[PDB]
Design a protein around this ligand. Structure first.
Ligand SMILES: [Cl-]
Ligand SMILES: [N]
Ligand SMILES: [N]
Ligand SMILES: [N]
Ligand SMILES: [N]
Ligand SMILES: [N]
Ligand SMILES: [N]
Ligand SMILES: [Pt+2]
Ligand SMILES: [Pt+2]
Ligand SMILES: [Pt+2]
Ligand SMILES: [Pt+2]
Ligand SMILES: [Pt+2]
Ligand SMILES: [Pt+2]
Ligand SMILES: [Pt+2]
Ligand SMILES: [Pt+2]
Ligand SMILES: [Pt+2]
Ligand SMILES: [Pt+2]
Ligand SMILES: [Pt+2]
Ligand SMILES: [Pt+2]
Ligand SMILES: [Pt+2]
Lengths: 121, 120
């Protein structure tokens, strides 16, 4: 079975955001258009070590009220992918938006790594 | 002086036609030059799609190194398998077409495939 850590890497990490077609290719490549069009998804364009290190940065509440969330001290390169108003499965269409923002992730397990993308600020 | 990335693109990238496909490709890509290479896999996907695998599922390499990556999606591949009748320099190849996850080893800056490890 896919672990929560693995699922986070598949859905949110892009350690290789280039072109207007990035989100279309990436949402496909990461199996996020298989059953449905996943409507919103963020990719972090940083090293896995740099994102895993967020689990030792600023402790904050998560959106659901758990207290195992962490805010990155630094801004990170992110791509926001959001489905168009016109997008219809199986023809999933996304707008790609590049930003430099703080990320908030939920951390769990041993090793203690991100398992949930909470938000970018 | 051929690079490891260049070597991977020549030996493994074709951006299966027929039972011929392998016989021509193994010869055309210089794999049968110094000896009949026993087994070879050709990935039929774009170079972009295969390079993207270096950012996908980190898995152990068959040699124990940690720099292997498995594709999240199945990709179209051709397994070329040397026959019994195959004798150097007349190398002969059975052509098997599959949709499988691929596993590649990646190296360098930029981080690119340098070794085809496995199909799963
Ligand atoms: Cl980077
Ligand atoms: N997986
Ligand atoms: N996630
Ligand atoms: N804080
Ligand atoms: N969350
Ligand atoms: N920041
Ligand atoms: N798989
Ligand atoms: Pt990037
Ligand atoms: Pt504070
Ligand atoms: Pt800031
Ligand atoms: Pt979660
Ligand atoms: Pt997620
Ligand atoms: Pt959440
Ligand atoms: Pt092909
Ligand atoms: Pt592919
Ligand atoms: Pt998997
Ligand atoms: Pt699979
Ligand atoms: Pt190699
Ligand atoms: Pt090879
Ligand atoms: Pt190998």
């Amino acid at each position: 079975k896919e672990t929560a850590a693995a699922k986070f890497e598949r859905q949110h990490m892009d350690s290789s955001a280039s072109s207007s077609n990035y989100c279309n290719q990436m949402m496909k490549s990461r199996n996020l258009t298989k059953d449905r069009c996943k409507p919103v998804n963020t990719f972090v364009h940083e090293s896995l070590a740099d994102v895993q290190a967020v689990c030792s940065q600023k402790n904050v509440a998560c959106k659901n009220g758990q207290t195992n969330c962490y805010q990155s001290y630094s801004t990170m390169s992110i791509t926001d992918c959001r489905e168009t108003g016109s997008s219809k499965y199986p023809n999933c269409a996304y707008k790609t938006t590049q930003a430099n923002k703080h990320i908030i992730v939920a951390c769990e397990g041993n090793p203690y790594v991100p398992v949930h993308f909470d938000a970018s600020v």
